[PDB]
């Protein structure tokens, strides 16, 4: 790998610089290199990894949606035939997106998840696994679509089970997991009632535990609780 000659600490330093410069492709490449050193990641480093890939795939998803909409419009009645170009370019973006997802899943499988014993690290990586299978599911149309959806569900479910046993209801990782699994239910699994129930129960159980928190922890937890409320508002 192109980052094999660079020090772990230098890769982490450069990932932080890349973030400041909004160079998220570079940031992701640096963090991939850092993971491939083979040592476990600290909390800060896990955050760098997640931020980098979230931003790269986020951009690809937004582009994919623009292109898919144009393609859908091209297939309506009365639309003039414009050739294969829209499908081709949507496919190009799609293939790049799938590549990034496969890269992240690969890092998680080789070997981040298996080395992650603490609840905070294990839940974080399993959430990521659910997220990147969810992104694959968003674009899936073939024989394996159900299996891709089930892979997301399984990863999220394992993360949920650990989070409920090992973390308080206000823990930001537990909250963010629940937020995203709720979106999975709504957008991927065609289960809006499950999505709404999860978001509500997560919000309410967090509300009841805020009294235990410092000001700074309260700030962190309430931010994500607001995202849960925002989704509930969108959905009800």
């Amino acid at each position: 790998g192109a980052m094999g000659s660079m020090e772990r600490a230098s890769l982490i330093q450069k990932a932080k610089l890349a973030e400041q410069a909004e160079r998220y492709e570079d940031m992701a490449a640096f963090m991939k290199g850092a993971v491939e050193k083979g040592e476990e990641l600290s909390c800060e480093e896990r955050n760098l990894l997640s931020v980098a890939y979230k931003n790269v795939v986020g951009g690809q998803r937004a582009a994919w949606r623009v292109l898919s909409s144009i393609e859908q419009k091209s297939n309506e009645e009365g639309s003039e035939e414009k050739g294969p170009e829209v499908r081709e370019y949507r496919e190009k973006v799609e293939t790049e997106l799938q590549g990034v997802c496969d890269t992240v899943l690969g890092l998680l499988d080789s070997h981040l998840i298996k080395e992650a014993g603490d609840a905070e690290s294990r839940v974080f990586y399993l959430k990521m696994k659910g997220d990147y299978y969810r992104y694959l599911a968003e674009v899936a149309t073939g024989d394996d679509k159900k299996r891709i959806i089930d892979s997301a569900r399984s990863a999220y479910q394992e993360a949920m089970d650990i989070s409920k046993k090992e973390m308080p209801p206000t823990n930001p990782i537990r909250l963010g997991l629940a937020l995203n699994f709720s979106v999975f239910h709504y957008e991927i699994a065609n289960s809006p009632e499950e999505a709404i129930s999860l978001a509500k129960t997560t919000f309410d159980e967090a509300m009841a535990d805020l009294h235990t928190l410092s000001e700074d922890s309260y700030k962190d937890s309430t931010l994500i609780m607001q995202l849960l409320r925002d989704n509930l508002t969108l959905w009800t």
Partner: peptide, 5 residues
């Protein structure tokens, strides 16, 4: 689109 983190 809904919020995720």
């Amino acid at each position: 689109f809904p919020a995720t983190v």
